[PDB]
Amino acid sequence: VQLVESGGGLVRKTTTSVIDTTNDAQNLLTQAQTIVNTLKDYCPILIATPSWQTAGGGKNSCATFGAEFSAASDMINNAQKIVQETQQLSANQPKNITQPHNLNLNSPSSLTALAQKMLKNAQSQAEILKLANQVESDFNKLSSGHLKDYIGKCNNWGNGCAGVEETQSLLKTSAADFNNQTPQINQAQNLANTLIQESKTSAQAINQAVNNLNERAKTLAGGTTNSPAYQATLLALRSVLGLWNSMGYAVICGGYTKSPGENNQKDFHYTGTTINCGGLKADKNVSLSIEQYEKIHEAYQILSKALKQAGLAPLNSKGEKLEAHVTTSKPSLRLSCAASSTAAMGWFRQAPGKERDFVAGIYWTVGSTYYADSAKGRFTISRDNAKNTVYLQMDSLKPEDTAVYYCAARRRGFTLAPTRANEYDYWGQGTQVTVSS
User: Fold this and answer.
1) Which of 8, 97, 227, 409 fits 223 for a cystine, CB–CB 3.0-4.6 Å?
2) Rounded-to-integer distance, Cα 405 and Cα 348, Å
3) Going by CATH, does the domain composed of 3-10+331-433 fall within 2.60.40.10?
C-alpha cells in the first residue's frame, strides 16, 4: 500500500454574495453611512494622475479630505432627517371637513385636532425644504475643493461617474418651485393659528388650506423630478457614490489585526476591476482592516446596484426588491493524497530542519475532523472514501507555511485523535509547498 501526495498550485477562488436588498431611502442611506463613517472616523492613509493624490499621498485621508468627508457626512444626515420628516409628514395628512360647517357638540375639539395637524404638516414641509437646501449647499462644499474637477464628470476610477450634476440641477430647480408656493403654505399656517385662536374661518376656507397642504405634501413625499426632498436624498446618495469612485481606490487596506505576521489578503471585485488589500497596522490615521473594507465594499455594491437598476424609491414608497452581487477572491491551495482498513488520515508538515508537526486529521468513516493550531481557521480537511483520497484545502497562506507536507494513515481505532507521527502507520513521501509574500 502506498500514499501519493499530489500538490495543486496556487489558484484564485472567487466567491459572490447575492444580497437581497431594496431601493428605499432608509436602506440606501445606511449603506452610504457605512462608507463615510468608515473613512471619516478611521482616516486611512492614501497611496502615493489627480491633484489631491500628489499632496495627500502618505498622509491620512482626513488631512486631505476632511471637508469632503464632513460635507458628505452632513448630506447623509440631513437626508436621513428629510426621510424622517417625510414619514412624519405622511402621519399628519389633515382631512377635509363637511362644507359648509356641520356644527356638533364635538366641533371645537375636532377643529383644534385639525388645526394641529395642519400646523405640524406645514412645519414638516418647512423643515424638509430647509434641509434640502442645506444638502445643496453642502454639496457645493463637497464639489468645490479637491474633487471640484473630478466628482461630477465621467478603468473609471478617479471620476465620480455618479450623475450628481444632473441631480443638483433637478434639486435646485424643484426647490425654487417649492419656494414659489410658500405664499400658499403661509396662508394655511396662519389660517390654522387663527382657528386655534378661536368669514375667513368658513369650511370652504379650511378645506382650501387643507387641500393646498396635501398637494404640496404629496409632491414633496411621493415625487421624483419635482420633489426637492427626493432630489436631495438622491444627491446625498449619488455624492457618496461619486466620492468613493473619485478617491476610494487610494485608501490603504489590509491592516494587520494583531500580529504583524498573519498575511490576510483579499481582493475586492468591482464592475471590471479588482482592488487588493494586503498584497501595516489597521487603526485611525493609518489603515483599514479587511473587515472594514469588506463593509465599505458591500455597502458600495448595494448602493451602486440599487441606484443603477431601480433608482431610489419615492420617499413614501417601500421599495422594489433587488439582488446585489458582492464578489471577492482570495488565493488558495489544495493538496491531495491518494491511497493504493483505515481509521484516520492526517497531514503533517515539516519545515526544513524541524520535526514533523501535525496539521489536520480526519476520522475515516464518520469524517470528523481535528486541527492543529497552525490549521485553525485557515485549512480544511476532507476525504473521498470512494476514491480513497484525503484533501487539504489551504486558505490564507503565510510564509511560515512553507514546508514539505506529508499525508499519513493510521489503521487501528483510537480514543484521542492521533497527532503524533508515531501513531500513524503509512506515509507518502511529501509534496513541497512554498509560499512567498
Assistant:
1) 227
2) 6
3) yes
